[PDB]
Every structure is written in C-alpha cells, then in structure tokens.
Design a protein around this ligand. Structure first.
Ligand code: ATP
Ligand code: SAM
Ligand code: MN
Lengths: 136, 279, 590, 370
C-alpha cells in the first residue's frame, strides 16, 4: 500500500480526542505496543475476537486499552463522513453511533468486508500517526 | 485493399519503453499517449515487431515493410503502421478473477477513428457502437456508471476503484461487439478507467541484479497487464495481393504470436493480432 | 554630447552551432576576441568608457576566458564614426586572413569569401547619439534601449554552399571545430602538441602549460594527477576528424584507471549565473548619488576573481563578462564539490560588491532595499549526454526557475503582470539538476538569501566522503527513501506551527529507533534543521503569492498549478535532492 | 482552360517535416531531429507531381528503367521535366507541366459551424508597437554593418521603450476577427512529442550499435488543417486521396474543392492577409528570398526580420528515386514570415520591384507580401 495522508490526519484528531496524547505531545508508552499488536491480533485471530479483547474495559492492563478502539471508531466515522455518496458504490456511509460498542456494531452489521478493510487501514494510520509523538 | 483495424490482445505482460526521464520510483515506464495519457504503442515499435516476425520471409518484408537498414538500395515500405491505442484492460473483480474494462470516452474515440479512417467493416460497427453508447448515456443520465451485460456479473466489484457493476437489461451487447471488446466486459466512466490505467495502478514489479549473492542493482518496472486489448490501423497503400494476403493470413492464424515490448526473453509482450471481423 | 554605443554579434546562434565543450569555448571567445580588437583603438586613444570599465588587466590573457562584453557605450570626439567603420572592415579582413591557412586542418580558403561570410554573419551595429547630459546614469539606459531595438535587424548570408569540400562557405564552424589546429608530429620520442589557432594564442597566452582543451573528460575528471590527454594523444598518433578519436581514447584510458575512478568522473557540471536586477540596481544608484563606475569596478573585480576561483577549483571558464558567467566544472575534484564552487563564487560577488559599492550598500542597508545578488543554475549530466541539451537545461534552470521567469512569463503572456503581482518576483535562487545515465534526474531549487543555503552547504561538506588519506560522519542511505515515502507525513508535521521541531524530532527518533541509528543522530539533526529552515523560507516567499495566484480569475487551472508551489513539499524535495547528491558522490560500484 | 483548386490537408497522424539535418556537413547526422512546423513549397509541389503521376498511372517502380520515351514525353508535359530548383529563381514560368501557380501554405481553422474558415497568419514582429523614425536629422544614425539608417524610435501602442524582456510577438499566430486581432499561441496550435528510436541489434553481423536517435513529431490541434491554392492548366484532374507530405511517411488527406472560375489565387491570399496591412511597412507573409540583402537593407530604415533555412531535394524527371537523393548544394536563407520591412520615404515600389523580380519563387508560393 501507500500512506494515506487524510487517514493520518483523522488518526491525529482521534488520538487527541480520545485522550491518548496529553496536552504536551506525549503518550503513555504501552499504547505503541497496543497499536502494533492490534493488527497482528486482527490477522491471526478474527476481527471480532480482537475487537472484543481490545475493547474490553475493566481488564488488567497498564493503561486504557479501549481508547484505541475509540480512536478506531472515530477514524472510521471520519472516513465514512468523507465517503462519496454515489450509486453503484459499495461503501456504506452511515456513522457508528457513539452509544454503540464496536463489537456490537460488527456483530449486527455483518458481511463485514468493508469494515475489515476500514479497520486495517485505520490501524495502519494509527500506527504511523503515533510516531509524531513521544512516549513517557 | 484499404485501411484495416487490428486488435492486439496481449497474452502476457507488455512493456514498451518510453525512454522518458523518470521523476519517481519507476525507472522503466511504458509508452503513453501525449494527449489522453492512455497506454499506447508507437508505430515504429509495431512495425519493428511485425517485421521481426516476418523477417524470414524476405520478399514479404521487402514488399510490405521496405528495405533493411543496411540495404545498399532503399525501397519505401508500402504499408503504413499507426499508433496502437488501448481498447480494453483487465481490472480486478470479486465474483470473477477479472473483468475487461472499457470506458465511454475510448468508445467514442474509437468511433471517431473508424469514421476518420474508414475501416473495411467500419459502418456496421459504427452504427451498433453508436446505438450502444446512446443507450449507455440514456441509462446513466449524467451519473457515474459501471454496466455489466452478463446477468451473472451483476453486483461485481471493481476492486481498485470501489464501485459496483450494474446490469441494464434493455441494452443488448451484440456478439460481434463482445468479440471486439472481450468477454466479461464492463463499461464505466472514463474517470474510473483513467484511475485504473494510471501509473499508481498499473502493475509495478521489483527487479534485482545479483553477483555471487550480492545485489548489484535495483530498479522497478511498469508493465501493461496481460489480456489487455489494443487497436491500431494498418494502411497497405496498394501492395501485391499475394504478399498482402500472406501477411493477413499469417497474422490471423491462431498459432501466430507476436512479441511487442522490451523483455522478450522473460516473455513480455506476446500478443495475437486479430482483424476486424464482418458484423 | 557625442556618445557612441556599440552592440555586436549573433552570440546565441554561434553558441547554438557548437556541439562540444571546446567548440562552445571557441564560439564564446570568438566574440570576446572580436570585441577586443574592435575596441582596442579607442582604448589606446584613451577615451572615456561608460559601459565596460576597460583597464589594463582585462586586456591581459586571463586563463583563456572572455571578459569583453558585446555592449559598449563610448564617448567619442568628432571623427570616430568613419574610424570605427574602417576599423570594423579591417578587423574583418584580419581574422578572415587569420583563418585562411595557418596550421589548421583544411585544404584552402579564399580570403574574400571568408570576409563576405563574416560581414553577412557578424552583426556590427553602433549608435552615435547626441545627448545633453554627461551623467552616466542617463546615457547608459538611453543608449541601452536603442541598442536593444537595434539588435532586431537580421543580416545573414543568402547562399551557403557546403559540398565538394573545397568550395565551403560556412567558415565560423570551421574555426570553432578546428580551433586546436592540427595535431602535429615531429619526432618519435617527444610529446605531440596542438598547433593552436589565433584564438588559443590570444586567450591562453603563450607561456607554457599549453594543454589546450580537447574533449570534456579532462576537466570532468581532474583530481587523479593522470595526464589523460598525453596518453590519448600518443594513442591516437600511434595509429594513422580527431575530436571523436581523442574523446574515445580518453574514455578508454579513464576506464583502465578503474582503481581510483569514482562515478562523478564521467559527469560534467554546467554553471550559469546572471545578475539579479542590475538595471533596477543602476536606477537605485541613480537615485542615491553613486557613480556607475563603482559598479563596473565591482563587476570587473568579481569577473577576475571568479576566473581565478574556477581555475583553482579545476573547471573551465567559458564566458565571464558583466553579470554573466558560464563555467564547465567537475562534479567533485580534490575534495571540493560544485556547490562549494558556487558558494565561493557567491562569496566573491558579495565581497566585490562590498569592496567597490560600500556607499550604496550602506544607503540600501537602512533603507531596507534588496542588494545585488547572483542567481545560479547548475546542470550535471553524463559526459555523453548531448551538450546542446545540457546547455538548454542550464538555461531553463537559471532563467525560468532561478530568476522566477516562469511566473513572470506566464503572467505576461496573459497580460496580468500588474504591480502587486510584480511584488512577488523572487530572486537570489539556485537551480540545480542532476540527470543520471538512466535519466533519473534529481532537480531542486533553493534561496541563497537565508541560512538554508549555509546549512545545505555544510551538510554537503560534512557528509560527502573525502579521498583516502581521518574519519567522516557516516552518511546513512536509508533516510533517503524514508523522506520520499513519508513525504506527506512530513508535510503534516511541517504544517503544525507550534510543535513543528518537536514533532519532526519525535518522528525521526521513532522511525529510526534501532541500535545502529545512534551514530546518525548528527545527520538526523542536520536534516531536521535544514528542513525547518527551508519550510520557513518557502512559506515567507510563497504563501501570499499562492493565495493571490489562486484568487486570480484569468489564469487557467493547469497554469495555476504550474505556478503554485507547495512550501512544505518543495522543502522536502530539496532535502531529498541534497541527500541523493550526497549518496551519488559517496557511492562507488566496487 | 486554367482551373483553380483549393487543397486542404488533414493530418491523420503525427507528421514530421525535415530540417537542415545538421549544423554542419560530411557524414554526421543529428541525434535530435527537429520537425519544422511547415513543409517547404518544394514538398507541396512534389506532392502534387506525385499525385498527378498516381492518377495517370506512370510511376517509377522497382530497380531502374528508362520509361518508354513516349511515356517520358507525356510525363514531361504532365509534371514538367525537372524538380524545384532555385537556379531558375528568376524564370518567368514555373517550368513544370500542368502545374502553374501554388499559393503559400495556409493554416485554416474549421469550426463546428462548418460554413466559414478562419485563416491564421504569423503575428507581425511590429504588432502592438509604434515605430516612428524621427527625421529631424543629425540627431542619431544607426550603422547596420556600415550603412546609414535613421534611428528606430519604438513605443508600445498603449511612454516606455522597447523592452525586449517582454517582447513575445514571435510566439503568437494571428487571425482576423470582427473587432481586433485574435492572438493564438504556437503552443495552442502545435503539439510536439519527442520519440526515441533504435535499431534492434541482430547479432552475427553489423557494427550497428550506433543506431540511436531522437525525433520530433508535430500534431495539429483538432480544428486546424493545412491548405493552399493550385492552378492546373487545361485537362488535369486532381482527385481527393491519401497523400505523403514530409518525412517519416507523414500521411495526410486531400479535399479538392474547385472554387469559382475567373479567380486569382494570389488575390485570394492577399484578401485573406488584408487585415494585417500597415501602410508604413511591408509584411512578409511567405518565406522571401533576395539574392543580396545589402540592397534591401539600403532600401529600408529597419528590417525587423528573422531567417529560415532552405534546402531542396533535387531530382530529375528520370532520377534514381531509390537511394540517397541529391540535395541543393547551396543552403539558402529566406526571410521568415511575419517579418516587417520599414522602407524609407517613398521607394516602396523599389522594394516591391526587388521582391517580385523572382517571379518563379512568387508562382511557387515564396516572396508573397501584403
Ligand atoms: N560592467 C557593467 N557596468 C555597469 N552596468 C553593466 C555592466 N555590464 C552590464 N551592465 C548592465 O546590465 C544590464 C543588462 O542586464 P541583463 O539584461 O543581463 O539582466 P539584469 O538586469 O542583470 O537581470 P535579470 O536577468 O534578472 O533581468 C544593462 O542595463 C547594463 O547597464
Ligand atoms: C542572449 S544574448 C542577447 C543579445 C546578444 N548578446 C547580441 O548581442 O545579439 C545576451 C547574453 O549573451 C551572453 N553573451 C554576451 N556576450 C557573450 C560572449 N562574448 N560570449 C558568450 N556569451 C556572451 C550574455 O549572457 C548576455 O546576457
Ligand atoms: Mn546578463
């Protein structure tokens, strides 16, 4: 592939909005491993089990792992906002509700090839955008 | 004994080198038209390839293509070769391995070229292609379109440009049009075709030079996808009927393969030249 | 009073007639020779010259370079008109005689035919105006505009018979093609020598060191202390016109020296420079009371110092006269690069401006007005790449990009130049292009106004390998592809105004986060500083220009996109091209 | 008895018109071969002769023959006995067969409303500027290579003086509008592409690695065609066909249209050029040749002119036609179209007499002015 600048911008805005990066351009160290491991988990396991594992709150982890799922949802929402509404197109542009867990959305919105592609692209954008900042 | 249309139908990857100065990662780019930026073959390359195939038949080469570069006496060739413009290209699909992509603009350009050149079977093709294009424009109504004509192909997905194939049931694709444009044909807007045929979407291959296990050089190559179709115009002037008939029969023989492009030894640019069949 | 203004020569056509470096030098020095011979009686008669300052030094041979321009403004007492006419006729009769039959490879020549061809080809127009003021600031432009309109009258030979050899009519190309004469043999154990023509004996002097130019490879590769021309001449004379044979032999001899051969030895650099708005500078020196003789002094001193610097670096001066410079130099020899030579030339120009124009410099300092500057165009090409195409590329670089004549030309063709748009004309630029043997062509442009140029030169000096002697700074080649691949991300980082430097440093640290990269922190920091400086200069120079270009309604979208330049991407491309040049100099296929 | 046709040439592909082939001579070729925007009038005349010999099936085919001297006579009275040469540049007749008069090649624009055609001419070099030649005397005199001439004071017609940094008339072509003069850039008319060519190395023979060249090919914009007028004498039919004009087998389509009788093609061309007329100067519309430029320069104060190169392929009525053609041993320089000659007071008739002294070139399509 090649790096998508618009997706990097969406990733920056979502990382700022989901309280990953502090007021200073700094983030907790473990989020790098979180973002890197998300794609490998998606490929090796299913998309649904990986989203369940990372979206799981009340887990025993060094930081808030569900924040990366929040960032992913925000990036997917921005992508669907920018999607071109034309006939004979495949992509569905409806946004993911803020009251919806990503797992539930993927559960009741199957045939998730578009969702899989969007999630992989958002993970790559997240990984590449996190390198602009410093780890505490 | 007049201008004739020929279809190329490459059976492998094709790389006809521009020789242009590259500004990006791809060192070897393929020839493209100056105005429309579509992939093309220069008439010099077509003449060279066809002369290479017929080089054994000395009399035919002398009569049609002319004298050799070292010939002590020069004879102009009676046959005039024209540019080979891209007709159809294979695009990635989901229900099928690929679809043969054509655009409305290239269809209109083909109609204009046949009207301007007055090909042998030009009239019937012009009429039927014009009716098909008018039906396409009537169904599209100014919107971006992607029309399949096989009912099984409805809902097909063009992967690179994420658009879906629609099936207009009232637009008949005549068998001769299928023979010309290809099987599993998709007619879409020229913007989609331009995106599909641009530098970022044409296949790019990495190549190596190894010396005792050490890499000496690295470069990237651009190729035209296999099963792509190109059309050119051949003007014979007025050649000997026997030599012209031999040329046409050898060209149209199913067992005849012509190498157009650079990398002959690794099988780049082997094609099967076809003639415009009567409609 | 009774001023005389002289313009001469179809310089562009004769330069077009050359396909080799030595032919180009001969064509360039032909007009300098003509101007010298035309104006030496008036200088001998000691009359005041308002354009070129002709002192004793310029009349001396200066390393075979032409310091004499084509435009001369001259104060004349009565009786100079017919004197100038007769001298022009006599200096055609001479030169026609000089090309008749010296030791020059040919058959025979008719002096009258050569004189007729030269009179039909060489333009000699002079204007004798009657002005009321003796002030140079008034007489110079008033005569200059009339010379400019005078240049548009065309004189040419009607018939050119060039066949059956011995009835030729094209003699200027005979002179430029045969300017080194006929290589002559007189012994079995000696050094073959060139029987140089009058141009060589007037340019290069006659005091030893008489290795006249032949083929481009000797200055393309002059750091090995290998007398390539001597071996080439001995090889050619060992068997049995000769320019091609010498070129081929020199290439072979350079090929058997693979041991100490670097890839840039087969590449040649073309240098072109012009004065940034000398006419407006003359207007400013007209407003503030400063004589133009100081500007002429500064230009002459800069010309002499530039000739000296080009010879010391190891290049060849083609033409240096007025504000114009043309040089053929090696890409890198004896540790110095082309850009080192460009920096030295810019420093020499600034030093001469300060030394001879201190009053005007002081006046323009507190008045907040631009100072005279040099725009540079550099083209590096394979030695076998056509010299005409290389010269056209250098001209395109200098004029169109370095002088920003693309913006001005596009605006003027559509008649939207105005004055607010004229406020956006950018000078003091360096245009550089390197085309490989495979046509990869790396090109970039930079502004010599700010510290970005200094940092670029320092980066080139730091990370370019010197020959074996104690250690260098270990340039890393992986950063070249990283910048290209991450260009859009770098643009995003550069567009962030508050955290630009921190974001750039963090990105470079996070991408190059391995053990090996601890030795490349200096390289990373240097490229970060250069990128930030270039982006700041680019936004300062181009932001409002881009906004006004986009807001214009006359211009088409394609012309708008050609005129509009992105600051961040331009800076990234400059860094990429600098790193590519460093790697190209450093790498050798062992 | 003397029928006049209008011939329009439509470029069916990329065309190439040959240049000097070299800046020198001997054996050298040019690695970069550039394409002239227009063919020489010799090319037009040869195309007419070849097409006439194609209509009446008398062609030189396969090695060499003598062509049955009765056929030699009929071919002489059809196409003449000789090609275009500048040796007979003062001859009062074209010396050819049924071909009598050929107009300079025109650039014609054909619009969608195909009822009117726009004829495009090169922009005069003095357009948009005023040239005065003040005659107060003893003020200032130009010496063009030693000849007296009044000073050319020049101003834009909109003061300031001639700024050669803004002079761009040489890049523009012009046509008549029902108002002012329409200026079209040469870029917008001609599309140029450079083609790389080699000969594939067939081994076991040849020292021919040296086959490597670049060529320039020109394409006309979709609405632009080439045209010229021809006069054919007595019984001579010119049928529309597909022709060769220029190098590299450049192919064109003729449309032969017979305009009304009792017409003068020179008058038609001058009527087309009427919109560029200025009474104080002479506008060169087609490449003009003068044997000596000294007399011409003496006849005018200013020659705002340029130069083009001419060299003809010289073939006899019975030549080899299969081999290296014989070219004119002398390379000739013509005055570029769009050049302007600012004559002195009076003496316009003298310059006109000098220009029309070569009636052979005038008939071919050279030395035409307005
Ligand atoms: N030795 C000299 N002394 C004074 N003026 C000089 C000298 N040589 C040249 N000039 C001036 O150079 C001017 C011509 O400059 P030129 O056309 O090369 O470009 P420029 O004004 O320097 O800048 P640009 O190319 O950016 O427009 C003339 O007006 C002339 O007065
Ligand atoms: C392009 S020419 C235009 C007019 C031309 N010099 C003439 O006299 O007809 C102007 C440029 O030619 C170059 N030039 C002038 N004299 C030269 C010389 N003797 N040798 C080489 N280049 C010269 C300088 O760069 C100058 O700015
Ligand atoms: Mn200059």
């Amino acid at each position: 592939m090649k790096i998508s600048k618009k997706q990097i911008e969406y990733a920056i805005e979502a990382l700022r909005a989901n309280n990953i990066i502090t007021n200073d351009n700094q983030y907790p160290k473990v989020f790098k491993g979180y973002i890197s491991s998300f794609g490998a988990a998606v490929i090796q396991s299913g998309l649904i089990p990986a989203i369940i594992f990372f979206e799981n709150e009340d887990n025993d982890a060094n930081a808030d792992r569900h924040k990366i799922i929040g960032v992913l949802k925000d990036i997917i929402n921005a992508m669907r906002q920018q999607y071109t509404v034309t006939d004979a197109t495949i992509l569905v542009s409806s946004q993911i509700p803020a009251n919806y867990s990503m797992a539930q959305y993927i559960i009741e919105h199957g045939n998730t090839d578009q969702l899989l592609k969007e999630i992989t692209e958002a993970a790559v954008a997240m990984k590449l955008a996190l390198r602009m900042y410093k780890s505490e | 004994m007049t201008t004739r249309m020929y279809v190329i139908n490459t059976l492998s990857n094709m790389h006809v080198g521009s020789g242009e100065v590259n500004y990006g990662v791809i060192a070897n780019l393929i020839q493209r038209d100056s105005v429309t930026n579509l992939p093309n073959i220069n008439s010099s390359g077509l003449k060279g390839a066809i002369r290479e195939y017929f080089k054994e038949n000395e009399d035919l080469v002398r009569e049609l293509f002319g004298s050799a570069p070292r010939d002590e006496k020069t004879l102009p060739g009676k046959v005039r070769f024209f540019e080979a413009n891209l007709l159809s290209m294979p695009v990635r699909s989901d229900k099928v391995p690929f679809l043969m992509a054509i655009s409305d603009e290239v269809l209109q350009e083909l109609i204009t070229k046949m009207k301007f050149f007055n090909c042998e079977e030009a009239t019937q093709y012009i009429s039927h292609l014009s009716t098909l294009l008018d039906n396409i424009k009537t169904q599209a109504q100014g919107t971006d379109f992607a029309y399949v004509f096989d009912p099984l192909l409805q809902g097909a997905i063009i992967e690179e440009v994420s658009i879906r194939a629609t099936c207009p049931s009232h637009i008949p694709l005549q068998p001769s049009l299928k023979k010309l444009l290809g099987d599993r044909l998709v007619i879409l807007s020229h913007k989609y075709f331009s995106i599909l045929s641009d530098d970022n979407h044409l296949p790019v291959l990495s190549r190596n030079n190894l010396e005792n296990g050490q890499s000496a050089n690295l470069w990237y190559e651009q190729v035209l996808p296999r099963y792509s179709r190109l059309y050119f115009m051949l003007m014979d002037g007025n050649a000997q009927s026997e030599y012209l008939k031999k040329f046409r029969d050898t060209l149209c023989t199913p067992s005849t393969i012509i190498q157009i492009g650079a990398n002959a030894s690794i099988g780049y640019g082997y094609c099967q030249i076809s003639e415009l069949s009567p409609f | 009073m009774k001023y005389i203004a002289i313009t001469l020569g179809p310089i562009t056509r004769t330069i077009e007639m050359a396909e080799s470096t030595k032919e180009l030098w001969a064509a360039s020095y032909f007009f300098s020779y003509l101007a010298k011979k035309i104006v030496e009686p008036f200088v001998k008669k000691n009359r005041t010259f308002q354009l070129p300052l002709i002192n004793e030094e310029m009349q001396k041979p200066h390393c075979g370079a032409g310091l004499f321009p084509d435009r001369y403004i001259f104060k004349s007492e009565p009786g100079d008109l017919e004197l100038l006419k007769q001298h022009s006729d006599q200096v055609l009769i001479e030169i026609a005689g000089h090309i008749a039959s010296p030791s020059l490879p040919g058959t025979a020549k008719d002096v009258s035919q050569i004189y007729h061809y030269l009179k039909s080809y060489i333009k000699i127009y002079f204007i004798e105006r009657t002005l009321e003021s003796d002030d140079p600031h008034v007489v110079i432009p008033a005569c200059e505009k009339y010379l400019n309109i005078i240049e548009n009258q065309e004189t040419f030979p009607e018939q050119e018979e060039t066949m059956i050899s011995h009835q030729k009519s094209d003699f200027l190309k005979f002179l430029i093609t045969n300017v080194n004469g006929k290589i002559y043999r007189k012994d079995k154990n000696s050094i073959p020598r060139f029987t140089g023509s009058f141009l060589t004996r007037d340019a290069f002097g006659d005091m030893n060191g008489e290795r006249l130019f032949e083929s481009i490879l000797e200055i393309s590769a002059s750091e090995l202390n290998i007398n390539i021309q001597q071996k080439a001449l001995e090889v050619i004379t060992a068997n049995e016109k000769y320019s091609d044979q010498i070129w081929d032999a020199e290439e072979i001899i350079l090929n058997d020296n693979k041991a100490q051969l670097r890839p840039y030895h087969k590449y040649i650099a073309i240098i072109k420079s012009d004065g940034d708005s000398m006419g407006e500078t003359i207007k400013s020196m007209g407003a503030y009371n400063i004589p133009i003789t100081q500007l002429s002094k500064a230009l002459l001193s800069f010309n002499i110092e530039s000739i000296n610097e080009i010879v010391a670096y190891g290049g060849k001066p083609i033409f240096i006269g007025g504000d114009d410079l043309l040089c053929f130099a090696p890409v890198c020899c004896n540790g110095n690069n082309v850009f080192n030579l460009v920096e030295k030339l810019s420093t020499c120009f600034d030093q001469c401006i300060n030394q001879h124009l201190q009053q005007y410099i002081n006046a323009c300092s507190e008045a907040q007005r631009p100072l005279p500057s040099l725009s540079f165009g550099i083209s590096i090409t394979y030695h076998k790449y056509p010299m005409f195409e290389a010269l056209h590329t250098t001209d395109y670089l200098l004029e169109m990009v370095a002088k920003d004549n693309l913006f001005k030309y596009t605006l003027s063709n559509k008649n939207i130049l105005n004055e607010n748009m004229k406020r956006f004309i950018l000078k003091n630029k360096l245009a550089f292009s390197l085309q490989k043997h495979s046509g990869q062509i790396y090109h970039t442009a930079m502004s010599k106004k700010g510290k970005s140029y200094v940092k670029f030169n320092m980066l080139l000096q730091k990370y370019i390998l010197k020959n074996k002697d104690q250690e260098s700074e270990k340039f890393l080649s992986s950063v070249i592809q990283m910048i290209r691949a991450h260009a859009e991300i770098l643009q995003i980082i550069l567009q962030n105004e508050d955290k630009r430097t921190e974001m750039l440093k963090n990105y470079f640290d996070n991408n190059f986060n391995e053990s090996c990269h601890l030795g490349y922190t200096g390289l990373f920091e240097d490229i970060q500083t250069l990128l930030c400086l270039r982006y700041q200069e680019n936004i300062q120079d181009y932001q409002n220009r881009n906004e006004i270009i986009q807001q214009n309604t006359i211009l088409t979208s394609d012309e708008k996109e050609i005129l509009i330049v992105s600051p961040a991407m331009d800076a990234i491309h400059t860094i990429f091209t600098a790193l590519q040049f460093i790697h190209f100099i450093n790498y050798n296929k062992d | 008895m003397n029928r006049h046709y209008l011939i329009t040439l439509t470029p069916m592909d990329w065309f190439f018109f040959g240049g000097e082939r070299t800046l020198d001579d001997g054996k050298s070729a040019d690695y970069i071969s550039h394409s002239n925007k227009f063919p020489q009038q010799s090319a037009l005349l040869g195309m007419i002769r070849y097409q006439l010999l194609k209509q009446h099936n008398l062609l030189s085919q396969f090695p060499y023959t003598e062509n049955k001297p009765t056929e030699k006579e009929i071919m002489k009275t059809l196409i003449g006995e000789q090609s275009f040469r500048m040796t007979e540049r003062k001859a009062k007749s074209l010396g050819l067969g049924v071909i009598k008069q050929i107009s300079p090649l025109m650039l014609i624009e054909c619009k969608d409303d195909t009822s009117s055609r726009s004829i495009y001419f090169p922009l005069p070099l003095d357009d948009g500027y005023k040239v005065s030649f003040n005659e107060t005397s003893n003020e200032d005199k130009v010496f063009y290579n030693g000849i007296e001439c009044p000073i050319p004071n020049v101003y834009p017609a909109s003061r300031k003086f001639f700024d050669h940094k803004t002079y761009n008339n040489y890049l523009f072509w012009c046509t008549q509008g029902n108002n002012q003069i329409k200026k079209l850039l040469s870029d917008e008319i001609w599309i140029s592409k450079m083609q790389i060519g080699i000969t594939k190395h067939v081994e076991e023979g040849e020292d021919n690695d040296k086959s490597f060249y670049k060529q320039e090919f020109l394409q006309l914009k979709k609405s632009f065609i080439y045209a010229f007028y021809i006069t054919l004498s007595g019984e001579s039919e010119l049928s529309s066909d597909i022709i060769q004009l220029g190098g590299q087998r450049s192919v064109f389509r003729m449309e032969v249209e017979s305009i009304e009788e009792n017409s003068d093609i020179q008058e038609k061309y001058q009527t087309a050029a009427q919109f560029l007329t200025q009474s104080d100067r002479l506008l060169i519309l087609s490449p003009t040749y003068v044997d000596n430029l000294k007399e011409l320069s003496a006849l005018c104060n200013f020659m705002w002119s340029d130069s083009i190169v001419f060299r003809n392929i010289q073939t006899t009525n019975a030549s080899n036609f299969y081999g290296k053609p014989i070219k004119s041993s002398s390379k000739y320089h013509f005055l570029k179209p769009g050049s302007v000659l600012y004559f002195k007071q009076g003496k316009r008739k003298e310059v006109e007499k000098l220009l029309m002294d070569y009636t052979y070139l005038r008939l071919s399509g050279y030395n035409i002015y307005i």
